[PDB]
Amino acid sequence: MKIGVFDSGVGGFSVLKSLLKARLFDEIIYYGDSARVPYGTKDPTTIKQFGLEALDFFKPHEIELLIVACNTASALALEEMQKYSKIPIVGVIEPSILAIKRQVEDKNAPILVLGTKATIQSNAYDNALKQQGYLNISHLATSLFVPLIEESILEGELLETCMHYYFTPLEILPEVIILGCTHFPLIAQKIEGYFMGHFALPTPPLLIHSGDAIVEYLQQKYALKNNACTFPKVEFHASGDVIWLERQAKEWLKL
Amino acid sequence: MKIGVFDSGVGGFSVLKSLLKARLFDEIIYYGDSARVPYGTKDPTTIKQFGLEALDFFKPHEIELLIVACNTASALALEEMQKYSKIPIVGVIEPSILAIKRQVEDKNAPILVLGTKATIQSNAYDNALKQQGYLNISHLATSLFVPLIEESILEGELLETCMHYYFTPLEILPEVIILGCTHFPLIAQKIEGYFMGHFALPTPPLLIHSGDAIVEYLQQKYALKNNACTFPKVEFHASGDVIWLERQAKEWLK
Ligand SMILES: OC1CN(C2=Nc3ccccc3C(c3ccccc3)=N[C@@H]2c2cccs2)C1
Ligand SMILES: N[C@H](CCC(=O)O)C(=O)O
Ligand SMILES: N[C@H](CCC(=O)O)C(=O)O
């Protein structure tokens, strides 16, 4: 099975890491729009067009399924992309809602959604959660986490201060935190550590990882493919420098 | 005179602000490539291609001069753009060198260049300064200042921590700091304050503002008096949502 994975840049590698572990797909065509990243700071019209242009990229590749690894593109462009695609397109938002339903029994559990400005502005998560009966949802655009993570600021005073900046105004302590952005898994332990330290919690809030949630969805849509692939072929493509993009895979994938 | 101003996004508004104050031009066409910003985190070939495409944008506008307000495009793309342009293109690097020549008599004065990653890696400032005999040049890509400033984080603990992050390893106290990025004028006083606080200075280092340096250059080159329109015709264009761009202009120009 040959698939595509689309992201604004290298963030999509956090989804790719999950995909690789699932051993579902024999061939993966990765495309990161690294000339135009970030998407999260930009507007619905721009991101929609970016999503359609991604469809054009994948045409000659004869993929069977397209994964939109980007939470921003999932929130803003997925519906438009599905309108103009014959293949299934799967984004990272809906599978996370499904993961919530499996992991969060109490409809009143406080859930906090973290994402880019565009993702949070869309209310994609809030709407889908409300539709599933969840009553206690907060959201926060933790925009600066993205550039910090791009700069490998994954610990230390600057990361702590940035987390404190965004989290300090929170009205409700979350029991569940959705990592609604490709980059956030890289600081998941730090986020857990923030809440435990600041609120004297012996264990952290439950974190939802977009890559693991999409994998859980795919593992049952393509059940015949579980553990099918001994070692996948992966092609790396970028609109920016493709060596720059591929170079980052080692870190993100823990190669 | 009708001119164009090119930037990656809204940062160019710090140059536009200088330009408007100087009353040099009757008409200004501003274009911010806000669908693709930042340029600073990307590679030379991509940035060069961005610069070439910006020329296409201005073609129907029949401008007489193109200003490249972006320090990143100036450092990486200016030479390529000039190669494909029939009109003069002026960037923000060379005018700042000329300002330093005027203002910094001591060739061994410690100069610190701040810029995006791409700008700093290009060594465009270092090379130009060495060419003019300056011997004591330091450089620092203060990359995260850009997103902080985009988010209007112009004060407080986050900014202070970020400045500390970049400035603490410095072994030479600068006499001159080049604000080698469109965004940096918006934290100029905070940068001044950091060095005075942390290095125990009665006076801050001299800060070189790219917008002010290009104004000085343009007046001399075109023999301009500060007597064009107080309120010129200004058009705003963007590759992203132009309403979003203009909304920000209102904040940066104030
Ligand atoms: O190296 C680091 C520097 N950097 C970024 N800086 C800029 C520069 C101009 C406009 C936007 C951004 C944002 C951003 C701005 C405001 C709020 C949130 C983000 N993130 C990019 C990014 C580049 C790649 C991913 S994010 C990455
Ligand atoms: N891939 C984006 C993060 C980087 C960007 O803003 O493009 C997301 O998951 O929201
Ligand atoms: N205009 C850019 C800053 C924003 C960007 O990285 O594109 C510069 O002056 O370097």
Method: X-ray
- Going from the Cα of B147 to the center of ligand 1, the distance in angstroms, rounded, reads 5
Where are the extended beta strands (E) located within chain B?
2-7, 27-32, 65-68, 89-90, 111-115, 137-141, 176-180, 206-209, 233-238
B165-197 burial, b for 16+ CB within 10 Å, e for fewer? bbbeeeeeebebbbbbbbbbbbbeeebbebbee
Tell me if B186 CB under 6 Å of ligand 3: no
CA distances to A16, A172, A212, A229, B151 from A218, rounded to whole Å, are: 13, 33, 10, 14, 37
Q: Which residues contact A129 (CB under 8 A, 6 or more apart)?
A: A97, A100, A111, A113, A137
Interchain CB distance below 8 Å, A165 and B158: yes
C-alpha A100 chain-centroid distance: 15
Is B229 among the residues known to form the active site? no
Domain boundaries, chain A: 1-91+210-255, 92-209
Cα(B182)–Cα(B187) distance, integer angstroms: 11
A18, A130, A5, A4: which is closest to A62 by C-alpha? A4
Chain B residue numbers touching A34 (CB-CB < 8 A): 42
Domain B1-91+210-254 sits in CATH at: 3.40.50.1860
Pocket test for ligand 2, best of A30, A36, A68, A182 (most atoms within 8 A of CB): A182
SS3 B33: coil
Query: CB-based contact (8 Å) between A161 and chain B?
Result: yes
* Resolution of the experimentally solved model in angstroms: 1.9
Nearest residue to A4 (alpha-carbon basis) of A83, A74, A60: A60
Give yes or no on whether B1-91+210-254 and B92-209 have one common fold: yes
- Determine the residue among B49, B150, B161 to mutate to test chain A binding: the one whose Cβ has the most chain A Cβ atoms within 10 Å: B161
Per CATH, the number for A1-91+210-255 is 3.40.50.1860
Report the CATH fold assignment for A92-209: Rossmann fold (3.40.50)
Specify whether the CB–CB gap between B237 and B29 falls below 8 A: yes
DSSP B91-129: -SHHHHHHHHHHH---TT--EEEEE-HHHHHHTHHHHHH
B38 cis-preceded (ω within 30 degrees of 0): yes
Which of B68, B96, B183 is the pocket-test mutation for ligand 3 (most atoms within 8 Å of CB)?
B183
Q: Is B59 in a helix, a strand, or coil?
A: helix
User: CA of A85, closest CA in chain B: separation in Å?
Assistant: 24
CA distance B48 to B84: 12
3-state DSSP: chain B helix, strand, coil percent, rounded to 5?
A: 50, 15, 35
CA separation for the pair A144, A99 (Å, rounded): 26
Q: Is the CB of A71 under 6 A from ligand 2?
A: yes
Q: How far is the CA of A130 from the centre of ligand 3 (A)?
A: 40
Q: Which residue has the tokens 């342009």?
A: B85
Hey, are the CB atoms on A45 and B241 less than 8 Å from each other? Answer: yes
For chain B, what is the largest distance between any 2 Cα atoms, rounded to a whole number of angstroms? 54
Cβ(B61)–Cβ(B234) below 8 Å: no
DSSP state of A204: P
Catalytic choice (A16, A66, A69, A70): A70
In the numeric block, which tokens belong to residue A161?
Answer: 């201060």
Residues in chain B within 8 Å Cβ distance of A45: 241
Nearest to A33, CA basis, from A52, A12, A56, A9: A9
Beta strands in chain A (DSSP E): 2-7, 27-32, 66-68, 89-91, 111-115, 137-141, 176-180, 206-209, 233-238
Q: CA-nearest residue of chain A to B34?
A: A42
> In angstroms, rounded to a whole number, what is the distance separating the alpha carbons of residues B48 and B72?
10
Q: Does B157 sit within 8 Å of A144, measured CB to CB?
A: no
Is A72 annotated as belonging to a binding site? yes
Given the structure tokens 């019209």, which residue do they identify?
A45
Q: How far apart are the CA of B143 and the centre of ligand 3, in A?
A: 9
Single out the catalytic residue among B70, B100, B141, B159. B70
B205: DSSP letter: P
- Measured between beta carbons, the chain A residues lying within 8 angstroms of B144 are 147-148, 151, 153, 158
Buried b (16+ CB within 10 A) or exposed e, A118-146: bbbbbebbbebbeeeebebbbbbbbbbbb
Specify the 3-state DSSP secondary structure of A85. Answer: coil
